[PDB]
Amino acid sequence: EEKEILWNEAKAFIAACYQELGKAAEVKDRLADIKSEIDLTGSYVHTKEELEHGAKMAWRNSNRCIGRLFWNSLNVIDRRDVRTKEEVRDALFHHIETATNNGKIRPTITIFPPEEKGEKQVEIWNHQLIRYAGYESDGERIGDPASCSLTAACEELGWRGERTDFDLLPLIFRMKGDEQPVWYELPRSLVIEVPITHPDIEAFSDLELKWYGVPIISDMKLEVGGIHYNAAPFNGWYMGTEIGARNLADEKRYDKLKKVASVIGIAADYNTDLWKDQALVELNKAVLHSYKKQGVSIVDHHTAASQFKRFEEQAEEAGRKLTGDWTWLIPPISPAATHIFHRSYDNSIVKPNYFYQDKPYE
Amino acid sequence: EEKEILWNEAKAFIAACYQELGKAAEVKDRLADIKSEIDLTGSYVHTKEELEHGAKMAWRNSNRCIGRLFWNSLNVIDRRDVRTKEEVRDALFHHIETATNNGKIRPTITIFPPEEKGEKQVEIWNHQLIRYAGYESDGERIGDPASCSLTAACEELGWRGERTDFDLLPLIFRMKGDEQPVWYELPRSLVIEVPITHPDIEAFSDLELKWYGVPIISDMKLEVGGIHYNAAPFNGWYMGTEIGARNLADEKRYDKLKKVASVIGIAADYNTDLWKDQALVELNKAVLHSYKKQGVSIVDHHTAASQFKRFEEQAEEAGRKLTGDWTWLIPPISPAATHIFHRSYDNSIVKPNYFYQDKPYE
Ligand code: HEM
Numbered sequence: 001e002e003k004e005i006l007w008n009e010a011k012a013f014i015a016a017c018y019q020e021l022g023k024a025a026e027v028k029d030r031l032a033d034i035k036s037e038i039d040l041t042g043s044y045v046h047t048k049e050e051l052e053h054g055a056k057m058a059w060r061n062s063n064r065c066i067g068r069l070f071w072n073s074l075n076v077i078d079r080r081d082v083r084t085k086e087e088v089r090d091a092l093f094h095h096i097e098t099a100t101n102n103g104k105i106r107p108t109i110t111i112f113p114p115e116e117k118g119e120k121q122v123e124i125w126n127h128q129l130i131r132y133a134g135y136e137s138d139g140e141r142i143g144d145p146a147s148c149s150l151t152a153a154c155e156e157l158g159w160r161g162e163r164t165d166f167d168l169l170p171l172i173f174r175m176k177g178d179e180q181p182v183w184y185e186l187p188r189s190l191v192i193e194v195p196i197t198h199p200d201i202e203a204f205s206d207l208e209l210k211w212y213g214v215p216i217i218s219d220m221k222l223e224v225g226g227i228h229y230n231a232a233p234f235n236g237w238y239m240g241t242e243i244g245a246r247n248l249a250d251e252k253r254y255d256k257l258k259k260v261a262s263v264i265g266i267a268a269d270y271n272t273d274l275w276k277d278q279a280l281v282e283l284n285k286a287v288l289h290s291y292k293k294q295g296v297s298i299v300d301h302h303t304a305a306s307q308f309k310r311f312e313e314q315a316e317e318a319g320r321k322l323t324g325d326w327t328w329l330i331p332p333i334s335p336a337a338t339h340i341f342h343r344s345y346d347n348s349i350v351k352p353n354y355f356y357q358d359k360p361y362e
Numbered sequence: 363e364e365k366e367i368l369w370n371e372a373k374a375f376i377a378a379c380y381q382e383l384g385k386a387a388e389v390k391d392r393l394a395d396i397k398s399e400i401d402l403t404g405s406y407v408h409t410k411e412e413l414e415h416g417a418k419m420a421w422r423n424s425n426r427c428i429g430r431l432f433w434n435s436l437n438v439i440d441r442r443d444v445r446t447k448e449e450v451r452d453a454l455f456h457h458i459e460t461a462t463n464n465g466k467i468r469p470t471i472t473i474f475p476p477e478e479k480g481e482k483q484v485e486i487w488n489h490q491l492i493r494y495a496g497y498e499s500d501g502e503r504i505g506d507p508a509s510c511s512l513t514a515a516c517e518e519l520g521w522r523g524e525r526t527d528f529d530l531l532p533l534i535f536r537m538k539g540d541e542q543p544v545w546y547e548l549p550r551s552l553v554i555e556v557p558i559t560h561p562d563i564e565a566f567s568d569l570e571l572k573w574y575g576v577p578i579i580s581d582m583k584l585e586v587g588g589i590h591y592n593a594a595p596f597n598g599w600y601m602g603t604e605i606g607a608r609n610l611a612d613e614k615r616y617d618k619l620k621k622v623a624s625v626i627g628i629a630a631d632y633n634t635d636l637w638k639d640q641a642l643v644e645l646n647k648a649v650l651h652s653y654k655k656q657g658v659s660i661v662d663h664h665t666a667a668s669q670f671k672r673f674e675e676q677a678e679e680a681g682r683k684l685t686g687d688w689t690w691l692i693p694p695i696s697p698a699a700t701h702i703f704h705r706s707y708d709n710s711i712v713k714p715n716y717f718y719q720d721k722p723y724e
C-alpha cells in the first residue's frame with residue numbers, strides 16, 4: 001500500500017511540476033526512472049529542480065498564508081547531504097544568517113534528508129529556530145508561555161535559561177540512532193532583535209518590549225510527490241499583527257495590553273471605552289515603526305492583503321484554482337478593512353504542501 | 363411529499379418544545395390532533411405557547427448571532443389575525459414603538475399569518491423596518507448604497523426621496539391578491555435616531571453622522587415545526603461594531619474612514635501608519651458614547667462576547683449542543699481579543715430557525 005501511495009503521489013507531482021517548468025515531454029522517461037527506483041529501493045530521489053519547485057508549490061498551496069504572492073522567489077537550500085549533528089547545526093546557523101541578510105529578509109527554506117520508512121533522519125524540536133523561553137513556577141510567569149513545554153524539555157537536557165522575559169532557546173534536534181537530542185546555544189551575533197518604540201509616545205520604551213527579526217518555522221513537514229521532508233525549516237518576514245496583535249497581546253502570550261494602555265495614557269477600566277482596541281492599534285503602530293526604523297523587513301496587514309489580492313488575480317490568470325483558509329487569512333485587527341473578509345475561500349488541501357506533525361516532547 | 367415534510371417537522375418540534383416546557387405527557391394527544399388537522403386541511407395551527415417558544419428556539423439556534431444569551435426573554439407578538447394592509451401597517455408601527463420603548467430597547471418579534479401552500483399572505487419588501495435610502499446617478503452617490511435597489515423600487519411606486527444621506531425609506535409590503543405592494547411613510551415621532559459625537563474630540567460632530575436606534579430585520583423567514591412564517595420582523599439592540607465598523611465604514615456603505623481620519627487629526631497617507639485601524643477605533647468609541655449619552659440601548663463587542671461565553675456555558679449545562687458560525691460571531695474589530703476567535707463552532711443548521719428568502723424586487 002505504501003509504495004502505491006508513493007507512486008501515485010509521484011505521478012501527480014512530476015506531471016504538474018514538469019508542466020509548469022515547460023518540461024512536459026520529459027515526464028514519461030522520468031516517471032519510468034522513478035518507478036524502477038521505487039521498485040528497487042522503496043523510494044525515489046528528487047532532482048534539484050524538482051525539490052526547488054516542489055517547495056515553491058508547497059508554499060503556493062498553503063491555505064493559511066497571506067504572503068503567497070511571492071511563492072516563486074523562495075530561496076531553496078538543498079541540504080540532503082548532511083549526515084552529522086555538526087553539519088545540521090551549521091546548516092541551521094547558516095539559514096539564520098542568509099535569511100536575515102542584515103535585515104533585508106530573504107524568504108528561505110533549508111531542506112534536510114527526508115524520512116525513509118517513516119524513520120526520521122533529523123528531528124528538529126524547536127517550533128521556530130529563534131524563539132523565547134517560557135517559565136511557570138509557583139504563580140510566577142516569565143517569558144513566553146507558548147514555549148513552556150519545550151523550555152522544560154531543554155532544561156532536562158542540561159540547558160539552563162537565565163529567566164529573563166526574552167531568553168533565546170538553544171537549537172535542539174535529534175539524529176537518527178541517537179536516544180536524546182543535542183542542544184546548541186544561538187550565537188547572539190546571528191540573531192537580530194528589534195526594541196519596540198512608538199513614533200510619538202516617548203514613554204512606550206518604558207515597557208522594555210522587543211521581538212526577534214526573523215520567524216523561522218522549523219517543526220512542519222514538507223511533502224513533495226510522496227516524499228516526506230519532516231525537517232525543512234522555512235521563513236518569510238513578519239506581518240506586523242503577528243507580533244503586535246498576538247505574540248505581545250494574547251492573554252496566554254506576553255499579555256501586554258493593560259501595560260500598553262497605561263503608557264499611552266488611557267484608562268483600562270470600561271469595555272465601552274474600547275481601551276483594548278486602542279491599545280492594540282498603538283502597539284501595532286509601534287511594532288511597524290520599530291522594525292522599519294531598524295531596517296528589518298516587515299509588512300503591515302493592509303499592504304499584505306493587497307499583495308494577496310494580486311496572488312488571487314495571478315492564480316486565476318494562470319488557470320490555477322485558489323485555495324485558502326478564511327479564518328487564518330483575515331488579520332486579527334480591522335479584518336473587515338481588507339478584501340479578504342468580504343469573500344470566501346475553498347479550504348481544500350492540495351499537495352505539495354506543509355503539514356503539522358506530532359511533537360517529540362509533550 | 364410536502365405533507366410528509368410538514369408532519370415530520372411537526373413531530374420533531376412538538377416533542378422538543380413540550381419537553382422544554384415540561385409538557386411531555388401532552389405530546390401524544392397534541393400530535394394526534396395535529397395529524398388529523400394536516401390530513402383534513404393540509405396544515406396545522408400553532409397554539410400561542412408553541413408559537414412563542416418556537417420563535418425563542420429559532421433565535422437560540424441562529425448560528426450567526428452573538429446576542430443569543432437572551433433568547434428566552436424575547437417578546438413575541440402574535441399577529442396571525444391580520445387580514446388588511448391597514449392592520450399590517452399599524453402592527454409594524456406598533457412593533458417599532460414597543461421595541462423602541464423610549465430607548466430601553468425590548469427584543470421583540472411580530473408574527474404575521476404564515477404561507478399556506480407556499481402562498482404568502484403578507485410579503486414585506488423592507489430589509490429592516492427602519493433603514494436609509496440610497497441613490498446612485500451620474501457618478502453621484504447619496505445615502506446608503508445597500509438600499510439602492512429597494513429605493514429604486516419604491517420610487518417606481520410613486521414615492522420620492524428627499525435625497526439627503528439619511529432619508530427614511532417608507533414601509534413597503536404586499537398583500538396576497540394584490541399585484542403591487544403599498545407604501546407608508548414612517549411617522550418621525552416613532553423613529554429614534556442618534557447623532558454621532560465623540561467623547562473627547564469636539565470636531566467629530568462636523569461629520570454630521572447619525573444612525574437609527576433600532577435594527578428590525580424584516581425580510582427573513584421564521585420556520586417552526588414545518589410552518590413557514592415568511593413575515594415575522596424581529597429586533598434586538600445594536601452591537602456597536604455593526605454601526606461603526608461596517609455601516610459607516612465599509613467602502614460600499616457610508617465609507618467614512620478618510621473623513622474620520624481627517625477630523626481626528628491623523629494623516630491618511632500610509633498603510634504602515636494604521637490610520638484606518640485608528641479611525642475605526644475612534645469611530646467605534648464615538649458610536650458607543652453617543653448611544654449611551656442619548657439613553658438608547660447598545661452593547662460593545664467585548665461585553666457581547668462575554669455574554670456569548672455565558673450562552674455557551676448555559677447550553678452545555680442544559681445539555682444542548684451549541685451551534686455557531688465563527689465567521690459571523692467574531693467581531694470586525696479586535697476579534698482576537700474575544701474568546702470566540704480562539705475556539706471553533708459546529709455550523710450545523712437546527713430548527714426552528716430564521717432563514718434567508720428571495721427578494722421580491724431585484
Ligand atoms: C514572505 C513573507 C511571509 C508573510 C508576510 C507570511 C504571512 C503569514 C502569516 C501572517 C501567517 C499566519 C501565521 C500565524 O498566525 O501564526 C502565515 C502562515 C503560514 N505561512 Fe506564511 N508568510 C510569509 C512567507 C512564508 C513562507 C516563505 C512559507 C513557506 C515556504 C510560508 C508558509 C506559511 C504556512 C505553512 C503557514 C501556516 C502554518 C500553520 O498552519 O500554522 N509563509 N504566513
Ligand code: HEM
Pocket residue numbers: 417421424426427428429430432436469470471596597598599600601604661666690716
Ligand atoms: C439582543 C440584542 C442582539 C444583539 C446584540 C445581536 C447581535 C447580532 C449581530 C452583531 C449579528 C451579526 C449581524 C450582521 O453583521 O449583519 C446578529 C445576527 C443575527 N441575529 Fe442577532 N442580536 C440580537 C438580537 C437578536 C434577536 C432578537 C434575533 C431574533 C429573534 C436575532 C437573530 C439574529 C439572526 C437571525 C442573525 C443573522 C442573520 C443573517 O444571517 O444575516 N438576534 N446578531
Ligand SMILES: CNCCN(c1cc(F)cc(CCc2cc(C)cc(N)n2)c1)C1CC1
Pocket residue numbers: 127215216217219220234235236237238239242356
Ligand atoms: C502558532 N500556531 C501555528 C503554529 N505554526 C506556525 C506555522 C507557520 F507556517 C507560521 C506561523 C507564524 C509565523 C510566521 C512564519 C512565516 C514563514 C512567516 C511569517 N510572517 N510568520 C506559525 C507552526 C505549525 C506549528
Ligand SMILES: CNCCN(c1cc(F)cc(CCc2cc(C)cc(N)n2)c1)C1CC1
Pocket residue numbers: 489577578579581582596597598599600601604718
Ligand atoms: C446584511 N447581511 C445580512 C442581512 N440580514 C441581517 C439579518 C439579521 F438577522 C441581522 C442583521 C444585522 C442587524 C441586527 C439585527 C438584530 C436583530 C440585532 C442586531 N444587533 N443587529 C442583518 C438580513 C438577512 C437579510
Ligand SMILES: C[C@H](O)[C@H](O)[C@H]1CNc2nc(N)[nH]c(=O)c2N1
Pocket residue numbers: 341342343344689690691
Ligand atoms: C465572506 C464572509 O463570510 C462575509 O464577508 C462575512 C464575514 N463575516 C461577517 N460577519 C458579520 N457579523 N456580518 C457580516 O456581514 C459578515 N460578512
Ligand SMILES: C[C@H](O)[C@H](O)[C@H]1CNc2nc(N)[nH]c(=O)c2N1
Pocket residue numbers: 327328329703704705706
Ligand atoms: C479556532 C480558530 O480557528 C483559531 O483561534 C485561529 C483563528 N485564526 C487564526 N489566524 C491566524 N493567522 N493565526 C492563528 O493562530 C489563528 N487562530
Ligand SMILES: [Cl-]
Pocket residue numbers: 215242247
Ligand atoms: Cl511568530
Ligand SMILES: [Cl-]
Pocket residue numbers: 577604609
Ligand atoms: Cl444594520
